[PDB]
Amino acid sequence: AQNPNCNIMIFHPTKEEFNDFDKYIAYMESQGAHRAGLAKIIPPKEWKARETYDNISEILIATPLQQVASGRAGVFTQYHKKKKAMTVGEYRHLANSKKYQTPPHQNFEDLERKYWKNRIYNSPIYGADISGSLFDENTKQWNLGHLGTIQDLLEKECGVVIEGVNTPYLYFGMWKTTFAWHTEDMDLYSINYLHLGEPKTWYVVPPEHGQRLERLARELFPGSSRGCGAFLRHKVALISPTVLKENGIPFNRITQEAGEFMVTFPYGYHAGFNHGFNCAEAINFATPRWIDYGKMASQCSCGEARVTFSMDAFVRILQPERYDLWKRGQD
Numbered sequence: 001a002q003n004p005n006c007n008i009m010i011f012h013p014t015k016e017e018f019n020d021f022d023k024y025i026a027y028m029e030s031q032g033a034h035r036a037g038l039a040k041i042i043p044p045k046e047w048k049a050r051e052t053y054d055n056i057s058e059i060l061i062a063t064p065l066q067q068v069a070s071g072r073a074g075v076f077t078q079y080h081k082k083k084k085a086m087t088v089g090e091y092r093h094l095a096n097s098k099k100y101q102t103p104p105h106q107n108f109e110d111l112e113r114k115y116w117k118n119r120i121y122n123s124p125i126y127g128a129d130i131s132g133s134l135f136d137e138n139t140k141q142w143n144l145g146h147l148g149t150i151q152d153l154l155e156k157e158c159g160v161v162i163e164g165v166n167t168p169y170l171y172f173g174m175w176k177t178t179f180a181w182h183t184e185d186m187d188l189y190s191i192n193y194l195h196l197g198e199p200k201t202w203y204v205v206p207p208e209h210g211q212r213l214e215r216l217a218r219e220l221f222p223g224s225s226r227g228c229g230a231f232l233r234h235k236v237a238l239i240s241p242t243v244l245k246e247n248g249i250p251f252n253r254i255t256q257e258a259g260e261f262m263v264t265f266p267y268g269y270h271a272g273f274n275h276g277f278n279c280a281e282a283i284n285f286a287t288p289r290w291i292d293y294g295k296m297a298s299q300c301s302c303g304e305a306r307v308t309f310s311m312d313a314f315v316r317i318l319q320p321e322r323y324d325l326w327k328r329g330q331d
């Protein structure tokens with residue numbers, strides 16, 4: 001069995017290997033990359049996502065989210081308070097202000113220590129989940145707006161044609177902006193490209209150990225657990241590496257820098273934080289190996305998780321028994 005310790009693998013495809021996205025994902029899996037839940041892909045030196053980032057300031061962040069924490073430094077939840085719209089140029093200035101800017105630090109490890117010590121005492125503002133793309137239309141390789149769609153994958157594998165679309169999302173971050181512990185909708189893959197700016201630190205639990213994280217989360221968030229049998233779908237809970245180590249939960253960590261891709265694999269729980277002003281682009285995708293994970297994915301039916309239009313068909317076809325209850329949660 002390849003990668004039996006479930007380490008995060010880093011790949012350096014050549015320009016030739018970067019042509020066929022599906023084939024390269026299947027290659028990485030042949031080497032055991034999925035066992036970590038997360039992989040890093042450094043693009044060939046010849047590749048670029050677009051020519052420059054000099055003209056992005058007028059993108060609108062219609063609903064910036066202030067991430068307010070409750071709890072203790074290593075075990076907290078966050079809620080998202082909606083703020084007034086602002087442009088990317090306005091948000092970048094805000095991120096660089098004395099109130100929000102990255103503190104002085106020695107290295108990524110020192111910054112990670114400072115994040116876990118101090119995150120809860122501040123409320124950073126995240127421009128998340130903005131439909132759109134920063135890939136140039138002429139970029140033909142690993143262009144996250146030109147991937148094969150999940151609807152077409154389900155149709156190719158299972159023969160059933162379904163409604164829905166699959167488009168990318170932009171994330172504008174600042175110091176301390178935080179992504180809570182989650183797997184993807186329907187335990188899909190994700191791919192994330194850091195277009196510009198400061199790094200993003202990731203934590204990940206191997207898919208084969210995901211239920212260990214869930215059991216810890218039910219212990220640490222006991223009211224939330226009673227409310228919903230899949231409350232991590234709410235994407236609000238944080239647990240620090242120190243707490244994970246104290247409770248014997250297997251995980252790994254890695255820092256993504258600008259110009260790098262990360263792939264999350266089906267049922268790979270992940271969480272993380274931004275080091276400073278940055279912009280990422282991410283999208284869900286599927287492969288044949290996902291189908292079995294989609295069929296088994298947990299679902300939130302309490303009403304909190306509220307998701308895209310396109311998840312309807314995935315539940316309806318892959319999880320017909322759960323469909324009625326889940327749809328009640330959506331309505």
Ligand SMILES: O=C(O)CNC(=O)C(=O)O
Nearest residue numbers: 171179190191192280282
């Ligand atoms: O970058 C972020 O805030 C969160 N991204 C992801 O969870 C991802 O790409 O799956």
Ligand SMILES: [Mg+2]
Nearest residue numbers: 056057058059
């Ligand atoms: Mg612009």
Ligand code: NI
Nearest residue numbers: 183184190270
């Ligand atoms: Ni994710």
Ligand SMILES: [Zn+2]
Nearest residue numbers: 228300302304
């Ligand atoms: Zn729920």
